[PDB]
């Protein structure tokens, strides 16, 4: 499949890349998707919902084998205000919160998470090139299966002044950045 | 002895408290000091050097018996830029790096340490109310005697943004925060 969005076997999916080459995104049965990549550029893709909700409990299971810069996350957006957010469950060779401003900590689903915000300036988004805030919750106890109670994150972010607008999509995604890897993830 | 600074038996000392009562700081022979506290407020005191240096090997030995929130550390300041720093060898009921941004890890003097930074905004300092970064290196294997090679910590912090302009004081200190305890520490 090429970059874009749609529905597959009951689930919304989104797949984006920077045009560099080196990545295959594949939709599988039910809530499954796979990603295989080798000397990629920047990409992110996965399965979930359009729209997401502010209290969804998201389950993920499978195998995640990055070789380099990559992360596995609950990933989504809100509109009005435009916000990109990540609840990062595992990552590869680089902590994607590096350089973001730490706002606090929240405990959820068996781990402490560190909470951060940063600003993206004139960058691609669901509504076109824009400037917008990006929120992060990064799990300390890395894992490739589990359950994410999104309300714990959204509420902790709100306590630190981190407002979310009207929900757009909400997926479990694999991201890569100039790396290689494989992953097979099933969402529920 | 009252809050303030000076020299005792050849060692610089600093003792500070928030005026809340419940702390008795004493200077002993050579590099020795003791603290006894009961339902204290915030305080920090100990012996060392004015100025410190960027490669001092600091030796300490004794007994550290907090009952509540407290830490035992190499504590100091630098100027231009203004920096407060702690190399924490032991602590009581609260890990003082909670909420700080983890920067990395360093191995020194028989243990791994986690390093962190946080921004202090309009807080007291050696030069008056100021906004500055506070650096932490927190020993995983707690102890109340040992040798601290400060260069290993300064180098780890410098990897993640610390610059040393001119050093100010550098002491082995007992801190407490709304707690009780006793300690007797000898520096050299």
Coordinates of C-alpha atoms in Angstrom, one line a residue:
Chain A
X1 CA 0.0 0.0 0.0
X2 CA 1.0 3.6 -0.6
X3 CA 0.8 6.5 1.9
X4 CA -2.7 7.4 2.7
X5 CA -5.6 6.5 5.0
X6 CA -8.6 4.1 4.8
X7 CA -10.2 1.1 6.4
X8 CA -9.1 -2.5 6.5
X9 CA -10.9 -5.4 8.1
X10 CA -12.8 -3.2 10.5
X11 CA -10.0 -0.8 11.5
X12 CA -9.0 2.7 10.3
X13 CA -5.4 2.9 9.2
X14 CA -2.9 5.7 8.4
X15 CA 0.4 5.4 6.7
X16 CA 2.7 8.3 6.0
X17 CA 6.3 8.6 4.8
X18 CA 8.7 11.3 3.6
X19 CA 9.2 9.7 0.1
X20 CA 12.7 8.4 0.9
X21 CA 12.1 4.8 0.1
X22 CA 13.0 1.7 2.3
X23 CA 9.6 0.9 4.0
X24 CA 6.8 -1.5 3.4
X25 CA 3.5 -1.1 5.3
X26 CA 1.2 -4.0 5.1
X27 CA -2.4 -4.4 6.4
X28 CA -3.2 -7.9 7.7
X29 CA -6.3 -9.7 9.0
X30 CA -8.5 -8.1 11.6
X31 CA -6.5 -5.5 13.7
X32 CA -3.1 -6.6 12.4
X33 CA -0.5 -4.7 10.5
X34 CA 3.1 -5.2 9.8
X35 CA 6.0 -2.9 8.9
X36 CA 9.3 -4.0 7.3
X37 CA 12.0 -1.4 6.6
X38 CA 15.6 -1.2 5.5
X39 CA 17.6 2.1 5.3
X40 CA 14.3 4.0 5.5
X41 CA 13.6 7.7 5.8
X42 CA 10.9 9.0 8.2
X43 CA 7.6 7.1 8.3
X44 CA 4.8 6.3 10.6
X45 CA 1.8 3.9 10.2
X46 CA -0.7 1.7 11.9
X47 CA -4.3 0.7 12.8
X48 CA -7.0 2.1 15.0
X49 CA -9.9 4.5 14.9
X50 CA -11.2 7.6 13.2
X51 CA -12.2 9.4 15.4
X52 CA -10.5 8.3 18.6
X53 CA -12.0 9.1 21.9
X54 CA -10.7 10.6 25.2
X55 CA -11.3 7.5 27.2
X56 CA -10.5 4.6 24.9
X57 CA -8.7 1.6 26.4
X58 CA -6.4 0.4 23.6
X59 CA -4.9 -3.1 23.5
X60 CA -1.9 -4.1 21.4
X61 CA 0.0 -7.3 20.9
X62 CA 2.9 -8.6 18.9
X63 CA 6.5 -8.3 17.9
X64 CA 8.5 -5.2 17.6
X65 CA 12.1 -5.5 16.3
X66 CA 13.6 -2.1 15.3
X67 CA 17.3 -1.9 14.3
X68 CA 17.9 1.8 14.9
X69 CA 15.7 4.8 15.4
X70 CA 12.0 3.8 15.8
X71 CA 9.2 3.9 18.3
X72 CA 5.9 2.0 19.0
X73 CA 3.1 4.2 20.3
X74 CA -0.5 5.1 20.6
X75 CA -0.5 8.0 18.1
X76 CA -3.2 10.5 17.2
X77 CA -4.4 14.0 16.7
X78 CA -6.9 16.5 17.8
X79 CA -8.3 19.6 16.0
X80 CA -9.1 23.0 17.3
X81 CA -6.5 23.3 18.7
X82 CA -4.4 21.1 16.4
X83 CA -2.3 18.7 18.6
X84 CA -0.2 15.7 17.7
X85 CA 0.2 13.2 20.6
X86 CA 2.2 10.0 21.4
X87 CA 1.9 7.5 24.2
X88 CA 5.2 5.7 23.6
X89 CA 5.4 2.0 24.8
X90 CA 8.8 1.1 23.3
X91 CA 11.6 2.6 21.3
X92 CA 14.8 1.8 19.5
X93 CA 18.2 3.5 19.6
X94 CA 16.9 7.1 20.3
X95 CA 14.5 8.4 23.0
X96 CA 12.0 10.4 20.9
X97 CA 11.4 12.8 23.8
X98 CA 15.0 14.1 23.7
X99 CA 14.9 17.9 23.7
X100 CA 11.1 18.1 24.6
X101 CA 10.2 20.0 27.8
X102 CA 9.3 17.7 30.7
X103 CA 6.0 18.6 32.4
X104 CA 5.6 15.8 34.9
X105 CA 5.0 12.1 35.5
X106 CA 2.0 9.8 35.4
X107 CA 1.6 6.1 36.5
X108 CA -0.5 4.0 34.2
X109 CA -0.9 0.4 33.2
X110 CA 2.1 -0.9 35.2
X111 CA 4.6 1.8 34.6
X112 CA 5.7 5.4 35.3
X113 CA 5.6 7.6 32.2
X114 CA 7.4 10.8 31.7
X115 CA 5.3 13.6 30.2
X116 CA 6.6 16.2 27.7
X117 CA 5.5 18.9 25.2
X118 CA 7.3 20.5 22.3
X119 CA 6.4 22.7 19.4
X120 CA 6.5 21.8 15.7
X121 CA 7.1 24.8 13.5
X122 CA 5.8 24.8 9.9
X123 CA 5.7 21.0 9.7
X124 CA 3.4 18.5 8.0
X125 CA 0.0 17.8 9.7
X126 CA -3.4 16.3 9.1
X127 CA -4.5 19.8 7.9
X128 CA -1.4 20.8 5.9
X129 CA 1.8 22.6 6.8
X130 CA 1.3 24.1 10.3
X131 CA 2.7 25.1 13.7
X132 CA 1.3 23.1 16.6
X133 CA 2.2 21.5 19.9
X134 CA 3.1 17.9 20.3
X135 CA 2.5 16.0 23.5
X136 CA 4.4 12.9 24.7
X137 CA 4.0 10.3 27.4
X138 CA 7.0 7.9 27.4
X139 CA 6.8 4.6 29.2
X140 CA 9.8 3.7 31.4
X141 CA 9.1 0.0 31.4
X142 CA 9.3 -0.8 27.7
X143 CA 7.0 -3.4 26.2
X144 CA 5.5 -4.7 22.9
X145 CA 2.1 -5.9 24.2
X146 CA -0.2 -4.3 26.7
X147 CA -3.2 -2.1 27.4
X148 CA -3.2 1.7 27.4
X149 CA -5.9 3.6 29.3
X150 CA -5.7 6.8 27.2
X151 CA -7.7 8.8 29.8
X152 CA -4.9 8.6 32.3
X153 CA -2.6 10.3 29.8
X154 CA -5.1 12.9 28.5
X155 CA -6.0 13.7 32.1
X156 CA -2.4 14.0 33.3
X157 CA -1.6 16.3 30.2
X158 CA -4.6 18.4 31.1
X159 CA -3.3 18.9 34.6
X160 CA -0.2 20.4 33.1
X161 CA -2.2 22.8 30.9
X162 CA -2.1 20.5 27.9
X163 CA -5.5 20.9 26.3
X164 CA -6.9 18.6 23.6
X165 CA -9.6 19.7 21.1
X166 CA -11.9 17.5 19.0
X167 CA -10.4 14.1 18.4
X168 CA -9.2 13.0 14.9
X169 CA -7.6 9.6 14.4
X170 CA -6.1 7.4 17.1
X171 CA -4.0 4.4 16.2
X172 CA -1.3 2.1 17.4
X173 CA 1.7 3.0 15.1
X174 CA 5.2 2.0 14.3
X175 CA 7.5 4.9 13.4
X176 CA 11.0 4.8 11.9
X177 CA 13.6 7.4 11.2
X178 CA 16.6 6.4 9.0
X179 CA 16.8 2.9 10.2
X180 CA 15.8 -0.8 9.6
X181 CA 13.4 -3.1 11.3
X182 CA 10.4 -5.4 11.4
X183 CA 7.2 -5.3 13.4
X184 CA 3.9 -7.2 13.5
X185 CA 1.2 -5.6 15.7
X186 CA -2.4 -6.5 16.3
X187 CA -4.7 -3.8 17.7
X188 CA -8.0 -4.3 19.7
Chain B
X1 CA 26.1 27.8 65.0
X2 CA 23.7 30.0 62.9
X3 CA 23.0 29.9 59.2
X4 CA 25.9 31.3 57.3
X5 CA 29.3 30.3 56.0
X6 CA 32.8 30.3 57.2
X7 CA 35.8 28.1 58.0
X8 CA 36.2 25.5 60.8
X9 CA 39.4 23.5 61.4
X10 CA 40.6 24.3 57.9
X11 CA 37.4 23.4 56.0
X12 CA 34.9 25.7 54.4
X13 CA 31.4 25.2 55.7
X14 CA 27.9 26.3 54.7
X15 CA 24.7 26.0 56.7
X16 CA 21.4 27.2 55.5
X17 CA 17.8 26.8 56.7
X18 CA 14.4 28.2 55.9
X19 CA 13.9 29.6 59.4
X20 CA 11.4 26.8 60.3
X21 CA 13.2 25.6 63.4
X22 CA 14.1 22.0 64.5
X23 CA 17.8 21.8 63.2
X24 CA 21.1 21.8 65.1
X25 CA 24.2 21.9 62.9
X26 CA 27.6 21.4 64.6
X27 CA 31.2 21.6 63.4
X28 CA 33.6 19.0 64.8
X29 CA 37.4 18.3 64.6
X30 CA 39.1 18.4 61.2
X31 CA 36.6 17.7 58.4
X32 CA 33.8 16.5 60.7
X33 CA 30.3 17.9 61.0
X34 CA 27.0 16.6 62.5
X35 CA 23.4 17.4 62.1
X36 CA 20.5 16.5 64.4
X37 CA 17.0 17.5 63.4
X38 CA 13.4 17.1 64.5
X39 CA 10.4 18.2 62.6
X40 CA 12.6 20.5 60.6
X41 CA 11.8 22.6 57.6
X42 CA 14.2 22.8 54.6
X43 CA 17.9 22.9 55.5
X44 CA 21.3 21.9 54.0
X45 CA 24.7 22.0 55.6
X46 CA 28.2 20.6 55.5
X47 CA 32.0 21.0 55.0
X48 CA 34.3 21.2 52.0
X49 CA 35.9 23.9 49.8
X50 CA 35.4 27.4 48.6
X51 CA 36.0 27.3 45.7
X52 CA 35.6 23.7 44.6
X53 CA 37.4 22.4 41.5
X54 CA 36.3 20.5 38.4
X55 CA 38.3 17.4 39.2
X56 CA 38.4 17.1 43.0
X57 CA 38.3 13.6 44.4
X58 CA 36.2 14.0 47.6
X59 CA 36.4 11.4 50.4
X60 CA 33.8 11.1 53.1
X61 CA 32.9 8.7 55.9
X62 CA 30.4 8.4 58.7
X63 CA 26.9 7.6 59.7
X64 CA 23.7 8.9 58.1
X65 CA 20.4 8.2 59.8
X66 CA 17.5 10.2 58.3
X67 CA 13.9 9.5 59.4
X68 CA 12.1 11.0 56.4
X69 CA 13.0 13.2 53.5
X70 CA 16.7 13.9 53.4
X71 CA 19.8 13.3 51.2
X72 CA 23.5 13.0 51.6
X73 CA 25.5 14.5 48.7
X74 CA 28.3 16.4 47.2
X75 CA 26.6 19.7 46.8
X76 CA 27.9 22.8 45.1
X77 CA 27.5 25.8 42.7
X78 CA 29.1 27.2 39.6
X79 CA 28.9 30.7 38.1
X80 CA 28.5 31.9 34.5
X81 CA 26.4 30.1 33.9
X82 CA 24.8 29.8 37.3
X83 CA 24.4 26.1 38.2
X84 CA 23.4 24.2 41.3
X85 CA 24.5 20.5 41.4
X86 CA 24.1 17.4 43.6
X87 CA 25.9 14.1 43.5
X88 CA 23.6 12.1 45.8
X89 CA 25.2 9.2 47.6
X90 CA 22.2 8.3 49.8
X91 CA 18.7 9.5 50.5
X92 CA 15.7 8.9 52.8
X93 CA 12.1 8.5 52.0
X94 CA 12.0 10.4 48.7
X95 CA 14.1 10.2 45.6
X96 CA 15.1 13.9 45.0
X97 CA 15.4 13.4 41.2
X98 CA 11.6 12.8 41.0
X99 CA 10.2 15.3 38.4
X100 CA 13.7 16.1 37.0
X101 CA 14.5 15.3 33.4
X102 CA 16.7 12.2 33.0
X103 CA 19.8 13.0 30.8
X104 CA 21.7 9.7 30.9
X105 CA 23.8 7.5 33.1
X106 CA 27.4 7.4 34.3
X107 CA 29.4 4.8 36.2
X108 CA 31.7 6.1 38.9
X109 CA 33.3 4.9 42.1
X110 CA 31.6 1.5 42.2
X111 CA 28.0 2.3 41.1
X112 CA 25.9 3.4 38.2
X113 CA 24.4 6.9 38.7
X114 CA 21.3 8.3 36.9
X115 CA 21.8 11.9 35.8
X116 CA 19.1 14.6 35.6
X117 CA 18.4 18.3 35.2
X118 CA 15.6 20.6 36.2
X119 CA 15.0 24.3 35.8
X120 CA 14.6 26.3 38.9
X121 CA 12.5 29.5 38.3
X122 CA 13.0 32.6 40.4
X123 CA 14.6 30.6 43.3
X124 CA 17.2 31.5 45.9
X125 CA 20.8 31.1 44.9
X126 CA 24.4 32.1 45.7
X127 CA 23.8 35.4 43.7
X128 CA 20.2 36.1 44.7
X129 CA 16.8 35.2 43.3
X130 CA 17.4 33.6 39.9
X131 CA 16.4 31.2 37.2
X132 CA 19.0 28.4 36.6
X133 CA 19.5 24.7 36.0
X134 CA 19.9 22.2 38.8
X135 CA 21.8 19.1 38.0
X136 CA 21.6 15.7 39.7
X137 CA 23.6 12.5 39.7
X138 CA 21.9 9.9 41.9
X139 CA 23.8 6.8 43.0
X140 CA 21.9 3.6 42.6
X141 CA 23.9 1.7 45.3
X142 CA 23.4 3.9 48.4
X143 CA 26.2 4.5 50.9
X144 CA 27.5 6.8 53.6
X145 CA 31.2 6.5 53.1
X146 CA 33.3 6.5 49.9
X147 CA 35.2 8.5 47.3
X148 CA 33.5 10.7 44.7
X149 CA 35.5 11.5 41.6
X150 CA 33.7 14.7 40.7
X151 CA 35.2 14.8 37.2
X152 CA 33.2 11.8 36.1
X153 CA 29.9 13.6 37.0
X154 CA 30.9 17.0 35.6
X155 CA 31.9 15.2 32.4
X156 CA 28.6 13.3 32.2
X157 CA 26.6 16.5 32.8
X158 CA 28.7 18.3 30.2
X159 CA 27.8 15.7 27.6
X160 CA 24.2 16.8 28.1
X161 CA 24.6 20.6 28.3
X162 CA 26.4 21.7 31.4
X163 CA 29.2 24.3 31.2
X164 CA 31.4 25.3 34.1
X165 CA 32.3 29.0 34.1
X166 CA 33.9 29.6 37.5
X167 CA 33.4 27.2 40.5
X168 CA 31.9 28.4 43.7
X169 CA 31.6 26.2 46.9
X170 CA 31.7 22.4 46.9
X171 CA 30.8 20.6 50.1
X172 CA 29.6 17.2 51.4
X173 CA 26.2 18.1 52.8
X174 CA 23.2 16.7 54.7
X175 CA 19.9 18.1 53.5
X176 CA 16.5 17.6 55.1
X177 CA 13.0 18.6 54.3
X178 CA 10.2 18.4 56.9
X179 CA 11.8 15.4 58.7
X180 CA 13.9 14.2 61.5
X181 CA 17.3 12.6 61.7
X182 CA 20.9 12.4 62.7
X183 CA 24.2 12.3 60.8
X184 CA 27.9 12.6 61.5
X185 CA 30.1 12.9 58.5
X186 CA 33.9 13.5 58.1
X187 CA 35.2 15.0 54.8
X188 CA 38.7 15.2 53.3

